[PDB]
Amino acid sequence: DLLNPIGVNCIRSFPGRGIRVWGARTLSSDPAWRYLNIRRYFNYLEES
Amino acid sequence: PSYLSPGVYVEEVASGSRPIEGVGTSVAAFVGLAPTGPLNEPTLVTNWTQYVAAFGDFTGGYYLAHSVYGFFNNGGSAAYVVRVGGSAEGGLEAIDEISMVAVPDLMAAYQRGAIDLEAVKAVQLGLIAHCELMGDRVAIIDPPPNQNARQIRVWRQETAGYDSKYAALYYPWIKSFDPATGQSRLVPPSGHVAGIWARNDSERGVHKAPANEVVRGAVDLELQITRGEQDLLNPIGVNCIRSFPGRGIRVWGARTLSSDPAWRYLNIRRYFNYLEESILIGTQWVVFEPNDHNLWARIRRNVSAFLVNEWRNGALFGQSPDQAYYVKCDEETNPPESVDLGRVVCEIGIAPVKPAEFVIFRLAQFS
Amino acid sequence: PSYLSPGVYVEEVASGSRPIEGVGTSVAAFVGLAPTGPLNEPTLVTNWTQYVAAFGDFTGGYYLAHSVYGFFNNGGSAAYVVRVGGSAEGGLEAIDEISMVAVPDLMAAYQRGAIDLEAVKAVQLGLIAHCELMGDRVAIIDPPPNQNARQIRVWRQETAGYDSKYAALYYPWIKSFDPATGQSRLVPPSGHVAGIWARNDSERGVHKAPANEVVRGAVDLELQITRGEQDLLNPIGVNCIRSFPGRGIRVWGARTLSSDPAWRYLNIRRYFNYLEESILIGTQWVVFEPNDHNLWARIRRNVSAFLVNEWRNGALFGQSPDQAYYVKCDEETNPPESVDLGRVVCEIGIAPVKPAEFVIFRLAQFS
Amino acid sequence: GQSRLVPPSGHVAGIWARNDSERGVHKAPANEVVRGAVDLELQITRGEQDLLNPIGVNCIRSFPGRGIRVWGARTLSSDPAWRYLNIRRYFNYLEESILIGTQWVVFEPNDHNLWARIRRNVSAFLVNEWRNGALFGQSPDQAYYVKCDEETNPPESVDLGRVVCEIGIAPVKPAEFVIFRLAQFS
Amino acid sequence: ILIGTQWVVFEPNDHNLWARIRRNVSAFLVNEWRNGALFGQSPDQAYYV
After folding, report:
1. How many other C-beta atoms lie within 10 A of the C-beta of residue C171?
2. Which chain B residues contact residue C184 at CB under 8 A?
3. Rounded CA separation C8/C31 (Å)
4. Contact at 8 Å (CB) between C143 and C154?
5. What residues contact residue C130 under an 8 Å CB cut-off, 6+ apart?
6. Distance between CA atoms of C22 and C201, rounded to whole angstroms?
7. Could you tell me the sign of the dihedral formed by the alpha carbons of C107, C111, C113, C116, in that order?
C-alpha cells in the first residue's frame, strides 16, 4: 500500500498460489496513462 | 473505507434491524430489622429457605419476616433484603433492577420505642425523595395503625400531604397468623401489595391496573368501610381493602398520591417507566453518528417496530396503528440550525389505556 | 494573497457557519464553616461521598452540611465549597462557571456569637456588590430567624432596602431533620432554593420561573401565612413558602428585589444573563476584520440563526419569527462617520415571555 | 508482569487507524473501545464531564456493561469553525488529494475548454465522494457547487494568467445529543 | 373549576397555554352538555369559551 501509489509493481508470494505478478502499473505522473494495457492498445491501434 | 492495494475486501453494512427488548419489573427491596444475619448488605433472596438460612425466621416479633412471607405467598419472584439492625435477646442506589422499595418494619419503633411522628415523617419524605431522584421506582406507604374515618382524611392533608406522584398509600391494616406463637396479630399491608403487583405483572401485562385482586393469606381487617366512607376517600389518593359478602377481601381503588390530573392512575406511571427504561437501555448505539437522513430512517423504523409490537398486545387504545401512536423524525423537526449543533429530536407520541372504574347501565323501556 | 511563482495554491474561504453554543447555569458556591478540611480553598464537590471524605459530616452543628445535603437532595449537579473557619472541639472571583453564591452559615454567628446586625448587613451588602460587579451571578438572601408579619415588612424597608435587582429573598425558615442527634431543628432556606433552581434548569428551560416547586425534605415551617398576609408581602420583593392542604410545602411568588419595574421577575434576568454570556463567549472572532458589508451579512446570519434556534423551543412570545425578534446591521445604523473609527453596532431586540400569576375566569350566564 | 500507568498516546492513533480502515475518514472516532487496557485510576461523573466538554478536553469513560470507551471527539480550537476533528481530517484529505492530482493544469492555453475540463473533473470527484454518504444532501445539487466560467474569470483576471475554480461543499457533523419526547396525546 | 385548575399558575403564558385551557374547558363543557344539563340542540348553542 506504500508502493502502489507510485509506479512500482511487485512480485508477491501467496500461500497456496506461489509467486505471482502484482500491480500492473507504469511510471507516469499524468493520470491519463496510469495503466499499461491502455498504452499497449493505443500503440497497437496507432501502428495498424 | 480506504483502498490502497489490490485484493478482495469484505465489509458489512450497518443497515439492518436492531430490536429493543423490555425489562423485568418484578423486583422489590425490603428494609427492616432482623435478629441475626448480614449487616448493611443488600442480600438477594428468591425462596423462603434462603431467608430462613440467612436471617432466621419468626423469633424476634418483627415485621420483616411477616412481610417477606406475604410477598412470597402472593407469587413473588426475587427480592432484596436490607437489615438495619436487630437483637438476639441502606445502599439501594447501587442496584438497578429494583422496581419498588418498602420499609415494612417502621411502625414497630413507633409503637414501643416512642420515636414520635416527626422521625417517621422525615424517613418517609427521604424515601419519597430517593424514589423521585432515581426516577425508576415506586414507593408503598402505610398509615399509623389506630385510625378511622375523619382522622386519616386529616392525617393525609394537614400532616402528610406528600403528593410527588411517586407513591401509593394503602389505608387498612391486615390481621395475619403467626406460627411462632400460633396467634393472630395486625401487620401493615406492605409486602402483600408488592406481591399482588408482581402477580399482575407476571400473569398479565404491566398495563393492567391491580384494582381487583384477592389479598391471599389474611383473615380479618378490624375495620369496615361503607359506600359513603369510600366515596369520601376516593377523591383523595387513598386506596382501600374491602370485604365483599361472597368474594372476600379484595383491593379497591388503584390510585396514587398526585394532585396533577395527568398522573392520577398507577398503571400509566408504571407503563411510562417501563417504556422509558427500555428506550434508555436499547438506544446507546446512536451516539456519535454521521447524522444524515439514513440515521433518521433507521431510528424511525426501530421505534415504529417497537411501538407496533407493543400495540399488537392490546396495550394501546386504537382500532388502527395510525390512531395509536405517531413518530416524527424528518427535516421539519430537524432544521439546519439544530443539526449544526449535533442534535436529534425524534418526537414520539402514544395513546395509553385507562381502567374502567364506573360501569353504568340504563334499562330503559321503549316501544 | 500574494502570487509570485507558478504552481497550485489551495486556500479556504472563511465564508460559512459559526454556531454559538450555550453555557451551563447549574453551579452554586457555598461559603461557610466546617469542622475540618482545606482552608480558604474553593473545593469542587459533585457527590456527598466527596464532601464526607473532605469536610466531614454532621459533627459541629453547623449550617453548611445541612445546606449541602439539601442542595444535593433537590437534584444538584456540581458545587463549590469555601471553608472560612471552624473547630474540632473567599476567592470566588477567579471562578467563571459559578452561577449563584450563598452563605448558609451566617445566622449561626448572630445567634450565639452576638455579632450584631451591622456586621450581617455589611457582609450582605458586600456580597450584593460583588454579584453586581461580576454581572453573571445571582444572590440568595434570608432574613433573621424570629420574625412575623409587620416586622419583616419593616426590616425590608427601614433597614435592608438592598434592591440592586441582583438578589432574591426567601422569608420563612425550614425545619429539617438531623441524624447526628436524630432531631428536628430550624435552618435557613439557602441550599434548597438553589437545588430547586438547578432542577428547573435541568428538567425545563431556564425561561421557566421556579414558582411552583416542592421543597424535598421540608417537614414543618413554624409559621402560617394567610391570603391577606401574602397580599401584603407580594407587592414588595418578598417570596413565600406556603403549605397547601393536599399539596404540601411549595414555593410561591418568584420575585426579586428591584424597584425598577423592568426587572420585576427572576426568569427575565436569568435568560438575559444566559444570552449575554453566550454572546460574549461566542463572538470574539469578529475583532480586527476588514469591516465590509460581508462581515455585516455574516454577523446578521449568525445572530438570526441563534435567535431562530432559541425561539423554536418556545422561549419567545410570537406566532411568527418576525414578531419575536429583530436584528439590524446595515448602512442605516453604520454611517461612514461611525465606520471611520472602526465600530460595529448590530442592534438586537427580543420579546421575552412572562409567567402567568393571576388566572381569572368569568362564568357568565347567556341566552 | 506487573500493571503500571502509561499515557494514552499510541492507543488513540491505533483507534484512528482502525476507524479510517473499517469506515471512511468522515466518521468521528467517538465511540471506540481501548483494547489492551485494564483500569483508569480515576472516575468521571456526568457533572465533571459537563464541566470538561465545553473546553477541548476529551475523556475515556468506563460504562457498566460496555467497559472502557473513548468519549467526546473534540479538538483544541476557540474558533467554532473547526470544533470537530472529523471535519479537519476530511478537509486535510481533500486538500492533499486536490494538490497531488492537479499539477497537469499549469502552463495551459487558458481557454474555456480548460474550464470545462476542470469543472468535469472536480464534479466527477465530488459525485464519487458524495455517493458514499460523506456529504449532507438528498440530491447532488444540495451537496456541492463548483463554479468556473466567465462570471468568476473576468478578462482583467485572465490577463495575468489566473484560474479560480470556486468550490463549495457541505460536510456532515456527528450527532452528540440524542433527545426523545415521549408525549401523551389523544 | 377551582379544584381542578391549580396547575395553570406560574406558566410561560404563551398561546399554547391558551389552547390547552380552551381544550380542557371545552371537553368538560361537552361532557356536561351530553347528559342533557344544558339547553341547546347543538354544542354551539349551549356554551361559548
Report:
1. 20
2. 118, 122
3. 62
4. no
5. C92, C93, C101
6. 13
7. positive
Residue that the C-alpha cell 444572590 belongs to: C139
Q: Give the distance between the most distant pair of CA atoms in chain D.
A: 74
C-alpha cell read off for B214: 384477592
Tell me which H or E stretch contains C82: strand C78-83
**What is the Cβ-side half-sphere exposure of residue C306, based on CA atoms within 13 angstroms?**
23
Residue C174 burial (C-beta neighbours within 10 Å; 0-12, 13-18, 19+) = buried
Nearest CA in chain D to B10: D22
Between CA E28 and CA E20 the distance in angstroms is: 12
C-alpha distance from residue B359 to each of B253, B355, C272 (Å):
14, 11, 54
Asked whether E and A share 3 or more beta-carbon pairs under 8 angstroms, the answer is no
Experimental method: cryo-EM
The dihedral over CA atoms of B67, B73, B77, B83, expressed in degrees to the nearest 10, equals: 20
C-alpha cell at A6: 507510485
Task: Judge contact between B336 and D169, C-beta under 8 A.
Answer: no
Instruction: Please name the member of D31, D138, D174 whose beta carbon is closest to the beta carbon of B342.
Output: D174
Indicate the SS3 state at residue A18.
strand
CB contact under 8 A, C312 and B338: yes
Which residue spans within chain B are E strands per DSSP?
A: 27-32, 43-45, 78-83, 100-102, 138-141, 167-170, 174-178, 183-187, 238-244, 248-252, 325-328, 343-344, 347-350
Give whole-number Cα distances, C165 to C138, C261, D64, in Å.
Answer: 9, 10, 46
Nearest to C16 among D46, D81, D162 (CB): D81
Q: How many other C-beta atoms are found inside a 10 Å radius of the C-beta of residue A32?
A: 9
Size of interface B-D (CB pairs under 8 A): 93
Element (H, E) at C240: strand C238-244
φ/ψ of D184, rounded to 5, equals: -110, 125
Residue D123 CB neighbour total at 10 angstroms? 14
Strand partners, D69: D33, D61
